[PDB]
C-alpha cells in the first residue's frame, strides 16, 4: 500500500464520473 | 459500469507494482 | 464487470472510511 | 491507505473472479 494513493486517486476520481 | 475496464485498469496495474 | 457491485461497493465505501 | 490491504486483498481476488 505504500502505492496507495496513486492507485486510489484515479479510481476514486473516475468513480466520480462513471457512477458506479 | 461502463467506466469499469478504464477505472479498473489505473488500479490493477498499480497493484501489479505495489504488491497490495 | 458482473463483479462489480460486488468491488466497488465495499471499496468505495472502505474509502469513505479509509482516506486513501 | 490504513484500510488499503484489507481493502484489496477481497477488491485484487474479486477482480481476479470478475476479469475486469
Given at each position: 500500500?505504500?502505492?496507495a494513493?496513486?492507485?486510489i486517486?484515479?479510481?476514486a476520481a473516475i468513480?466520480?464520473?462513471g457512477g458506479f
Open positions: 500500500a505504500k502505492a494513493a496513486a492507485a486517486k484515479a479510481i468513480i466520480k464520473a
